[PDB]
Design a protein around this nucleic acid. Sequence first.
RNA 1: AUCAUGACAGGUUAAUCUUUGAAUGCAAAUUGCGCUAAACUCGAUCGAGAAGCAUGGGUGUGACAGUACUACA
RNA 2: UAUUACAGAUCCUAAUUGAAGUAGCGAUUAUCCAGGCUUGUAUCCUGGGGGCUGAUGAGGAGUAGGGUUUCUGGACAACUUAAACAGAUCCAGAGUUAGUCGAUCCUAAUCUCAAUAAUGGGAGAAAGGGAGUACAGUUGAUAUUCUGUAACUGACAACAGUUCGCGGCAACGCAUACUAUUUUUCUCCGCCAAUCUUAUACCGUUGGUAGGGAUCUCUUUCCUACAUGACAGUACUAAUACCCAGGGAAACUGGUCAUCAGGCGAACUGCGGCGUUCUGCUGGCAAAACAUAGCUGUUAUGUCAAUGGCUAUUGGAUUGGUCCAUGAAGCGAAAAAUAGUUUACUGGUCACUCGUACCGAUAACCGCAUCAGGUCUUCUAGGUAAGUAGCCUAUGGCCAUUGAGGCAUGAUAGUUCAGGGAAUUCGGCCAAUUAGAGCUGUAACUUCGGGAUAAAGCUUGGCUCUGAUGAAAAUCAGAACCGAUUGUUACGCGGAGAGCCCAACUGUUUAAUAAAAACGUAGUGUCGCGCUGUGGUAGUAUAGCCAGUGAACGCGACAUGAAUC
RNA 3: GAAACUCUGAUGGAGGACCGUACGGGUUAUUGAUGUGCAAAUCAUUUUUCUGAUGUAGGUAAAGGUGCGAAAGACUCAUCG
Lengths: 237, 68, 50, 115, 77
Amino acid sequence: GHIVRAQRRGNGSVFQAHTHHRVGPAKFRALDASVISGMVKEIIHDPGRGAPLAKLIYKGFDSALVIAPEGIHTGQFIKCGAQADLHIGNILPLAQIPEGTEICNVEHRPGDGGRYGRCSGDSCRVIGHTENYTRIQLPSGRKALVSNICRATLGIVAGGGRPEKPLLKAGNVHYKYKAKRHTWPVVCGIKMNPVDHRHGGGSHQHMGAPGTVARSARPGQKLGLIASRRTGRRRGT
Amino acid sequence: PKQVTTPKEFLALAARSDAKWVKVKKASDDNTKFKLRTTKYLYTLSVKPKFVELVQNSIPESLEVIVL
Amino acid sequence: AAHKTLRTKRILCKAMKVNRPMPQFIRQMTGVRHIRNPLTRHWRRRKMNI
Amino acid sequence: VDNRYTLRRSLGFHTIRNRVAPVRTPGNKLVAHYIAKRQNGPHCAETGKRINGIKCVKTCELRRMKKNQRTVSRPYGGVYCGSVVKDRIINAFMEEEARAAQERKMANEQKKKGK
Amino acid sequence: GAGTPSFGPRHNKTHTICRRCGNCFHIQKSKCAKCGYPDATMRHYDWEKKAHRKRAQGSGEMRHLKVTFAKLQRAYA
RNA sequence: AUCAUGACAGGUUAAUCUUUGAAUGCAAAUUGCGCUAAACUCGAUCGAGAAGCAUGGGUGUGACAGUACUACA
RNA sequence: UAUUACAGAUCCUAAUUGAAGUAGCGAUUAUCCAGGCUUGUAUCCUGGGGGCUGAUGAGGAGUAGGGUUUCUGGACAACUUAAACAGAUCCAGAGUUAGUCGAUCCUAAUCUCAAUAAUGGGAGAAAGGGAGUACAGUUGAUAUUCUGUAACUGACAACAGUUCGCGGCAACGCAUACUAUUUUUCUCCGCCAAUCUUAUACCGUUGGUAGGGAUCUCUUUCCUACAUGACAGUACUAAUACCCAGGGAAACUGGUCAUCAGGCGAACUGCGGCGUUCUGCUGGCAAAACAUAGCUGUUAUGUCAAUGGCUAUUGGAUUGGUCCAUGAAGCGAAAAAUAGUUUACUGGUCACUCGUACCGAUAACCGCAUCAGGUCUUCUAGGUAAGUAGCCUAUGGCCAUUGAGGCAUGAUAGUUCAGGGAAUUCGGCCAAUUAGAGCUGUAACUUCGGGAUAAAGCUUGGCUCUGAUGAAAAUCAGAACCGAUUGUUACGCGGAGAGCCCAACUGUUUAAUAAAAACGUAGUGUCGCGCUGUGGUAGUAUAGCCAGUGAACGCGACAUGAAUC
RNA sequence: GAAACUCUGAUGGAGGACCGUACGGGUUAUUGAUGUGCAAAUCAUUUUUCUGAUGUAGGUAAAGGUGCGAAAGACUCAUCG
């Protein structure tokens, strides 16, 4: 057999991110001990990422490409800190914020940059305050103990509802993955011959083998549904 | 190559100790052009045949004068 | 060419001054006959590969 | 007649730097003359508008020109146009005047306790 | 398809003259295939023992080295 | 050039020793881009050429860094 | 004593037969006649016919590559499918001139060392960035490089004369330093579409003068020529963008080809401000260059006056639309602010290094070769026409191509064929018919967008006029009359309709027997994982690489393959 | 037209729309010519596409049980299960 397209993404020659026109890494300023006001100089769109970024100035002018909540405008004053009040814009630690509210770009570790809840039209919800660890629900469903000192932007991330509209033409998806990375178009494994992929070969196109494989299964062998505790139509539940 | 309107300003440019020659030259409409050479530029002076005779005399004696 | 480098130009010089007939007086001196200049060529037939 | 004309420079291709225009010589011969590049010249920060009172030439040949024609006379002469400078005066006055009146306020308010 | 027509656009040069070898210096990869420049050691293998002795000592002038052979004749004769 | 003030295709040793190469002032598909107390040599105090300047490690010499250890204030 | 005896091994190497004076001498417009030079020319040159190429040209020029093929002189043993005095062949000499064109300098994708007391250094583009040049002349070959003439840019020096901040309500104007820090701008950026306008080319209405061509007759005719560089200046005409002063808007007004603009201040008025374009007038500048006329190197006259483009290309201006697409960096330059130190501005010498000839496919490159193949780009005339089509022709370049004689048969590329009209054949394969434009007229079915140029009819020339719309020298409509009923005259231009199957669709694919129903796609669905993680890779250095400049509207793994049911 | 709005004409210039040029990109048919070729894949006529998932140049990245592959076991210097 040959090495399979799933294995070949590691070696990373043509399968690298197209990172040329990307404006910078989206994160907070570092922590550095109250309250600090910060004007939104402008809000710009970087390629690949569906969200906007908003370039702040903590005037020297110290810059920070923070990811943009919805309802931010140019020449708003954003207020990072503990004793900053509640507006959509402001960047509070999880000690201060009320529970049962939608927050954006929340950090895992303090002073980190921002980790959970970054893509367009997403938000971490806050469940409740234990003592040190403010428990929050992530967009998927999963729940996470996160320390109260670490920061999070208030409100929902901008650019919501982009997949509501379908892309009618193959050309629209060509321009989508030009900004991101080469991973498209996908040739299906059944169509390929036996050497190229596991599902390939045979007189008539069909999978033949069970098509559902363990965590223990090797490189080359992990193809199709990996460790699928259910399959088929998820009716109810 | 600049042109110079006033006959007085021409004679200031002539007596700089830059200028190597002046060239006299007949023109259309019975005019004539006094082309002062300088290291940088060539200063031309269009004149009518009323004040043609006086200007040549006005020019410094030392500077060489090539007639055409 | 044009836009040749200098050390490219050095090789093309040496390749054309070396291209000539063998002199007459070596055959008179040594008395050997049938020696050809090895670095003779024609531009159209054999390329240099330099 | 044949009015076709060669490129003079040894670059063949039709890039932005290698562009030509046909011109009649003194000798009745058409010939390539090469186009010098366009310049936008100084826009302003804030809004993004053209300031007046300066030519769009290259900034290198802006140096060769007189110091007069490089600038506009006011404070923030080149960078900011007129009405944006008016707004900076009004705000930077009344930000400082409110802060100065705050020092008058916290002087005046605390004196009520003594009397 | 793969023959005469596709020989047409063959104008770029893969290899260029090499400084140490002077012979096949790879422009993109920057290495002399024949001699291994710029590795400080000079390339030879025992599987090409034929091709090595074309390059190796004896082939050139030996300006310093021939006079040091000639001393050792005189001392032992 | 001949009984020598010694011919030259002789043989050594010593000079001179171009651009390179371990290649070594920094590079190189480029005759690209540097730096220097005196002395040297032309050039008429101040330019140029000539000749220097690599990395690694050894012994010596010097200088800097430290809320490392310690004494005397 | 042995590298010891050959007819064979599709044996090895070297030479040589028949076939055979046979197959064949292709492709590319077309050659003919008189002279010159010669032992000798259809071929090498001259002159004159007849032709071809027919602005994506065998025209004039360049990247990449070639490397002397360039140029002059002499030469024909060989080569250039015959011939040869010719040649990209042979031989002997000669030729490539730069501060302004390039390289050099900066970084991009990307590659490679070093430090971690570090926060980088270096490489990487002869199409990106990038200070600065033009004309005329000259050689057997070089020219934006040489000469003449006129500019311009940078760096390093002193030195002479001015000057120690003012105008406008405002937009802004006018003569002002340097170091540093920070901030901003220029450099500077996708694609598509529309309108307006310089320059160049071309066609035009009005004339004109210089020379040449044409002539039985006709033509106050036909052709050529009617031109001004970089650079520097300052008039008022007149534009659009934007801003300023007054002005203070519904009976809403102003404005575009189009969208539109306005109390966050419109119309409108200023001999406003300012940027970019424009017209005229100069300097450069007629001294040059070109065309006539005459004299033996140079003297004469002349290169003029008026004013349109519905035509094209280029530069620029004013805008719009489009994106789950938002379309380089760096060196460098100027400005501003805040400190501190202050006088400034205008007006001789020098400019290193390396490339520079010619070809650019048509014989100079890659295909073993002077190979009907292949290979990036530039300047782009007239007529016909919707035209960068096809067809014809000025400027420029050419006859690339063995000759002499025959003409039955056959091969191949072509026009045409009475009557029939697919009977031929596996099969309407092939060819024929259809065709451009204007005016009529258009069905079932449909995802309501399509189908649709559906189908099916008619008209089309020449000549003399008339009218409408524009500014307009253009284009459209209408009527007479004419003869072989014919007219998109050559050139170029769909045969059409009615069923059924497969894939929805634009797209991709076995370079060299398969272009499809195969692959792809949007759409639909399932599975894994919250970063100390997941899917990879990588290999001994406790190396760090890819998704990741990333975070579930995400990343990765599969399967189905638009919509409708 | 009581209204909600919808009839006629112009304006406008959207679309992985259509016809159609090339020394553009492909290569359907004649199973034509050639098959001692001009050519170790050509020529003629016909045909497909022609603002895009477009073509194309230079530099640059990926290397042999690997690479890359809108997948044909295709391609990786006339060489590839």
